[PDB]
Design an enzyme around this catalytic site. Structure first.
Site: not given
Ligand SMILES: CCCCNC(=O)[C@H](C)C[C@H](O)[C@@H]1C[C@H](C)CCCCCCCC(=O)N[C@@H](C)C(=O)N1
Length: 377
Positions: A35, A220
């Site tokens: 992440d 992201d």
């Protein structure tokens, strides 16, 4: 020695990419989601219906308790747990071990995904957004401080059940074609960048560029879709709708609430536009663009029912917290997170998913005046 890291990522479409890691002594194997949208390293440490395994602190002789609680809220999903430290390594990564901060998840809500195959999360962003505060050193910072691993990593996310590579500490040139184009990391918290222009099928959206970064724009790997601020989202859908008018859509489709199907091998890709996002470059008044093919924002969703047609879900959604360049965007390229030089590079990926008459691309240089005015303050 980067070849050992090639193909070290796995995952299920729409459920995130994970890398294998080991925590504790003796080593406990776990699949950790990568992440870049967060900065906390956390693992399920308590039973959960969606977890096949979890971190067992009592079984690790190197585990140290920090006697501090922690909670982390995401766009979707949240968890809370107990902070501590332990030895960690990455089997298919650099040959080293480091003591890092680890949040043992004891309670969660809409975080773990059923059948995703991962039991933890690796926040690769900066300490500024780490919880409870920026004093909790993120995993990569610890890695760089304790070992000789260079301060940078790259991600090659390959879509269609999914695979990819996280090259830790460097750039693997065999994974991309053409040249790498770099955009400045605006500020070191999220991997924040600045979008200076947007075009759909070669036509400028003609909005004040601040709208493109209204609030902020981040990269992201932990978000599936291309998320756009309200005003930008509306203009894009309007444009995509108009270009594909010759077709019928449940309308809930455009909200991602319903999927569209077509007879196998008959998807009318030609009617869906390519999207070009121009990013601030490295030199004065210079930018470059990355182009997205409809095959990227029309995520394939298997039809459990009559598996006869090809169905898809609209992977572009509205946001209220700025633009988010998720997997929809990254899957088309080799992305270098050059923390050392505070920049993010983009290059056409070797595992790109191109159609027959159009090609995803990263092109430059372009001249763009007043790019700094595109940043929101
Ligand atoms: C605490 C400060 C940092 C907060 N960061 C975030 O919330 C970032 C922007 C989002 C994270 O990457 C979170 C990461 C989530 C928990 C875990 C990955 C789940 C797989 C993909 C699921 C679908 C998806 O697309 N989720 C998005 C909406 C999401 O919330 N992504």
């Amino acid at each position: 020695s980067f070849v050992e890291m090639v193909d070290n990522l796995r995952g299920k479409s729409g459920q995130g990419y994970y890398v294998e890691m080991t925590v504790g002594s003796p080593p406990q194997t776990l699949n950790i989601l990568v992440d870049t949208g967060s900065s906390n390293f956390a693992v399920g440490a308590a039973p959960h219906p969606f977890l096949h395994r979890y971190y067992q602190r009592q079984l690790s002789s190197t585990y140290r308790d920090l006697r501090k609680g922690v909670y982390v809220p995401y766009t979707q999903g949240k968890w809370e747990g107990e902070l501590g430290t332990d030895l960690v390594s990455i089997p298919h990564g650099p040959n080293v071990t480091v003591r890092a901060n680890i949040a043992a998840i004891t309670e969660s809500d809409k975080f773990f995904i059923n059948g995703s195959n991962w039991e933890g999360i690796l926040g690769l962003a900066y300490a500024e957004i780490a919880r409870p505060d920026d004093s909790l050193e993120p995993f990569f910072d610890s890695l760089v401080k304790q070992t000789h691993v260079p301060n940078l990593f790259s991600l090659q996310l390959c879509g269609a059940s999914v695979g990819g590579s996280m090259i830790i500490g460097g750039i693997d040139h065999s994974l991309y074609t053409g040249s790498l184009w770099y955009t400045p990391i605006r500020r070191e918290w999220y991997y924040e960048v600045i979008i200076v222009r947007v075009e759909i099928n070669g036509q400028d959206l003609k909005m004040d560029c601040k709208e493109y970064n209204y609030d902020k724009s981040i990269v992201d790997s932990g978000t599936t879709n291309l998320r756009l601020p309200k005003k930008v989202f509306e203009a894009a859908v309007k444009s995509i709708k108009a270009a594909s008018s010759t077709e019928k859509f449940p309308d809930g489709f455009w909200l991602g609430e319903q999927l569209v199907c077509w007879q196998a091998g008959t998807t009318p890709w030609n009617i869906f536009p390519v999207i070009s996002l121009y990013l601030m470059g490295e030199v004065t008044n210079q930018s470059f663009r990355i182009t997205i093919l409809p095959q990227q924002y029309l995520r394939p969703v298997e039809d459990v029912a009559t598996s006869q047609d090809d169905c898809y879900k609209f992977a572009i959604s509205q946001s209220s917290t700025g633009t988010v360049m998720g997997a929809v965007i990254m899957e088309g390229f080799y992305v270098v997170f050059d923390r050392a030089r505070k920049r993010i590079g983009f290059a056409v990926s070797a595992c790109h998913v191109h159609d027959e008459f159009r090609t995803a691309a990263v092109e430059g240089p372009f001249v763009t005046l007043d790019m700094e005015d595109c940043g929101y303050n």
